[PDB]
Scaffold this active site. Structure first.
Site, mmCIF file in Angstrom:
data_model
loop_
_atom_site.group_PDB
_atom_site.id
_atom_site.type_symbol
_atom_site.label_atom_id
_atom_site.label_comp_id
_atom_site.label_asym_id
_atom_site.label_seq_id
_atom_site.Cartn_x
_atom_site.Cartn_y
_atom_site.Cartn_z
ATOM 1 N N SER A 1 0.825 -1.204 0.000
ATOM 2 C CA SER A 1 0.000 0.000 0.000
ATOM 3 C C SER A 1 0.862 1.258 0.000
ATOM 4 C CB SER A 1 -0.952 -0.002 1.197
ATOM 5 O OG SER A 1 -1.955 0.984 1.041
ATOM 6 N N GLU B 1 -9.189 -5.218 -4.464
ATOM 7 C CA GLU B 1 -8.431 -4.110 -3.893
ATOM 8 C C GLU B 1 -9.331 -3.074 -3.230
ATOM 9 O OE1 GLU B 1 -5.319 -3.321 -3.445
ATOM 10 O OE2 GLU B 1 -4.257 -4.943 -4.470
ATOM 11 N N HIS C 1 -7.895 -5.503 0.528
ATOM 12 C CA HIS C 1 -6.610 -4.818 0.454
ATOM 13 C C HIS C 1 -5.764 -5.128 1.684
ATOM 14 C CE1 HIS C 1 -3.815 -1.779 -0.931
ATOM 15 N NE2 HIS C 1 -3.928 -1.095 0.193
#
Ligand SMILES: O=C(/C=N/O)NCCN1CCCCCC1
Ligand SMILES: O=C(/C=N/O)NCCN1CCCCCC1
EC number: 3.1.1.7
Lengths: 540, 540
Positions: free
Chosen positions: A200, A331, A444
């Site tokens: 991330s 995601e 995610h």
């Protein structure tokens, strides 16, 4: 006393702790100070190297977590609290950790350096999911992870001024990389084989180190998991950074009415406030209601980044560089319960079309009404334009492709077409112990626990297949750290992972099944975000 | 002496001719005058009913073809010659043909009325492919076909004037339908069960009769094959129609040097010119290089069409109406050899990426550069953006969806959701005797020979399965003409043809295999043409 738990670095002596894994012990050195505490007059300033110390610094436990916002929407929920700080908050947080194999490698061993994510506003290297004892034991690698200032303390920027230049959180990471170059040999690590990997916001930080010349010489490989520096959330302009920093000062009484104006008086007023007061007003400076948008992020000012990440990626020469990129299957599903109407983690989130149309403006903020209609056109199944389940997956794809998948695909294509050797994956396994609702699929950030071998923890309830799957992933990451190639150097039985090219666009699927080669990282959807929509925004 | 070949109508008496089919004889009355010859001072004027005549008019052969352009690109090529005039050209061309079963039906029989296509600039009811002897023998219905003025003689419009009001070619068709109401009973036909059917420009004409009140009461069912009145080619504005008519007058020397150019003197000058001279400058008034664009088409002036066909379709009540619409598999492939760069009917037409980008501007004329970018975005396989074969089929889809498929699907959805019973099909069988290249697939217009039972001709080399396939289609069209439902009212074993609805969007595939129900007439592509693209053009 073990002789291998005592190591001398350039600053002084350290005492490490001994960690147990089902396959053997590992020597760990948790809490090494690599910078002077950025306190008082040092707030918002670039880090300074840690001065040498007397005696033996105890490196047997994780140090403090940098001041940051704490998720409290779901108290006691595992899915959210696994990312919350597990140590007390403090501005004295610039410490790094070193996991070294045991018996300590007598020969230089490649080094893995982890950079945590968290939207540049949160995160810590002390989280249980980032525990590197299993990866170091199973693959005999040297793993390093550092803390860096997040939120306003790391990325509040008044561009031009010397009291708050911004990007100091990125400089915290750079100083930790310089520390690895000067000291990782004392732990048995090879300073000539350093592989950065992050997820991330950490993956975006890894990408910004590739695009920054002073940082580029501190490592040799890069792994970007579910993130990229060219994302719409990863950077901010000079003008918007000044407005966000000025409003935060206003919300905490800076400057005192009505004396004050320039940046010297504004930052001095900001330095007199308890760190918690600045945190409590961080989310009140965002320009609009949105998801996957953060207040204080790296600023494009011409110093750390001579130009925008997109400009540097296009004009970059990446010969002699090996990159590993990838994304998870879903995601965007995690971000929809943080602003999109009709969504809840405790029901099925079967939204109506009116909620879907409103959610597009939250998932794609600050775009024209015509641009929103182009998004709705591409992500509507016009045979079932009202089906709540399809609309739920559509908005998840809208947020995921806009913020993660297409920024990563754009970067991966430009890297391979400009001299870099690139490998791409898509993580498609949902952990059996996942506490998030089933409709989120593979959310995610939930490939990290398998990369770090967390299923090997005997106190956890992973299945036997996930244990074998975790070891196969650690092999992939370790092989890429050693040879720049995730494939086994000699094994012909295992199926091969072909490189990612700008033409063939090949990637592999990572799950319980063996490798499967696929083509195109959402080529149709990402052509809209990367090619058409910029032209649609130019002609307003 | 066969007394069934002598029939008396309101204008006088006619002598027909017996036609042979492998299943039995058919009575035909070819060349019946239904209007006064629109010659001399009657050029560009609405038609006048045919005055009654003395004696017996010979109705044993087709009459003259209306003046029109003749395709001479490929001399002797069957694929183009089959549409060219097969009788002498003349302005005295307003004649209709009546095929009636033999023995003549003693009971009122439903009537099929054919309106040929040809971009409103060509076509004739005398073509071999429109032979009605097989459809009338096999299903025992009455088939009527008329000639109508095409090109400038039928659609040159100076809006507001009385010498050239426009749409007189549509009025020729209306007069032929008034003739059917007053005389089809003399042939054994039921004037209370009249079903219109036409293809391409003929299908657009049938659609314009649905939207014109004076024409709506002359028929009861409609069939639109590969065409619709709301197509971007089927209508033209008043200002553009005036510019095209004035440009044509200029090309033929009207008005003379130093003469005023009002509508009265301009049309008067046009009437003195030989008919062939006007035809020789027809293609020199179009705005730019394009395909599927025609010079003189029906004009939207508030008379025959009180508003645009799109406005009338949306605000229309269609209760008590059964429609049968459909398209062929490769609608646009045939038009590409008529202007698109890199295309040739005598090679594989493996165009390049640059030729595809240029063909989009020819296939979609007069759209902004941004609008063309959106077309390229939707019709590019971004996993194979340079593959010549996929580019060829992509540009074929661009022309087919923009001109035929999406205008038809939009009409079929509005009709069903506003009271009409709609059936939809997709013709997917390529004739075994087709002379066009293989890469064109099922080109525009090549289902007509199967609707009219042409494979039953012993002189032609069709296969045995195409003969049975042609009998299925003639049964479908006849069942729809009789009962408004193409399904067999006596056989539930055969596959059912579900109605087309705005929600389910169900249609069937017509080929040698049994019926297969599918959903969505290119819903994703037609959402771009019918929803998003108009919004883009408004914002420019
Ligand atoms: O980044 C966000 C966005 N919240 O709206 N939340 C923090 C949760 N993430 C999830 C996985 C990425 C590593 C940090 C923890
Ligand atoms: O309609 C056109 C368009 N030419 O660019 N050409 C005439 C050929 N068609 C053939 C298929 C429709 C029936 C009328 C004749």
């Amino acid at each position: 006393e073990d002789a291998e738990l005592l190591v001398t670095v350039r600053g002084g002596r350290l005492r490490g702790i001994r960690l147990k894994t089902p396959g053997g012990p590992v020597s760990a050195f948790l809490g090494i100070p690599f910078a002077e505490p950025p306190m008082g007059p040092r707030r918002f300033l670039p880090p300074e190297p840690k001065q040498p110390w007397s005696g033996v610094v105890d490196a047997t436990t994780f140090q403090s977590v940098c001041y940051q916002y704490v998720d409290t929407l779901y108290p006691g929920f595992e899915g959210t609290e696994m990312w919350n700080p597990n140590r007390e908050l403090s501005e004295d947080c610039l410490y790094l950790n070193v996991w070294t194999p045991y018996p300590r490698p007598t020969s230089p061993t490649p080094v893995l350096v982890w950079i945590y994510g968290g939207g540049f506003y949160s995160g810590a290297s002390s989280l249980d999911v980032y525990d590197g004892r299993f990866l170091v034991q199973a693959e005999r690698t040297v793993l390093v992870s550092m803390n860096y200032r997040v939120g306003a303390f790391g990325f509040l920027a008044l561009p031009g001024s010397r009291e708050a230049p911004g990007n100091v959180g990125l400089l915290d990471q750079r100083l930790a990389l310089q520390w690895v170059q000067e000291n990782v040999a004392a732990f048995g690590g090879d300073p000539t084989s350093v592989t950065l990997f992050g997820e991330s916001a950490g993956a975006a930080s890894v990408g910004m180190h590739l695009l920054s010349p002073p940082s580029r010489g501190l490592f040799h490989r890069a792994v970007l998991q579910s993130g990229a520096p060219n994302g719409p959330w990863a950077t901010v302009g000079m003008g918007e950074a000044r407005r966000r920093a000025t409003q935060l000062a206003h919300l905490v009484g800076c400057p005192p009415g009505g004396t004050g104006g320039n940046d010297t008086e504004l930052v001095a007023c900001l330095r007199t406030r308890p760190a918690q007061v600045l945190v409590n007003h961080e989310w009140h400076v965002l320009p609009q209601e949105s998801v996957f948008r953060f207040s204080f992020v790296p600023v494009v000012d011409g110093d750390f980044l001579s130009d925008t990440p997109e400009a540097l990626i296009n004009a970059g020469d990446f010969h002699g560089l090996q990159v590993l990129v990838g994304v998870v299957k879903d995601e965007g599903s995690y971000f929809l319960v943080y602003g999109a109407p009709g969504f809840s983690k405790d029901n099925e989130s079967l939204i109506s079309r009116a909620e879907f149309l409103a959610g597009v403006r939250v998932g794609v903020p600050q775009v024209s009404d015509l641009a929103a209609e182009a998004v709705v056109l591409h992500y509507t199944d016009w045979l079932h334009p009202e089906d709540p389940a399809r609309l739920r997956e559509a908005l998840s794809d809208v947020v995921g492709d806009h913020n993660v998948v297409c920024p990563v695909a754009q970067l991966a294509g430009r890297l391979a077409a400009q001299g870099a050797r690139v490998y791409a994956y898509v993580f498609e396994h949902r952990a059996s112990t996942l506490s998030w609702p089933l409709w989120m699929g593979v959310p995610h950030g939930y490939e990290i626990e398998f990369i770090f071998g967390i299923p090997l923890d005997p106190s956890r309830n992973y299945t036997a297949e996930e244990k074998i799957f975790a070891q196969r992933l650690m092999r992939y990451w370790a092989n890429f750290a050693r040879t720049g190639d995730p494939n086994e150097p000699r094994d012909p039985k295992a199926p091969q992972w072909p490189p990612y090219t700008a033409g063939a666009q090949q990637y592999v699927s990572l799950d319980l099944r063996p490798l499967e080669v696929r083509r195109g990282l959402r080529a149709q959807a990402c052509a809209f975000w990367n090619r058409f929509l910029p032209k649609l925004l130019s002609a307003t």
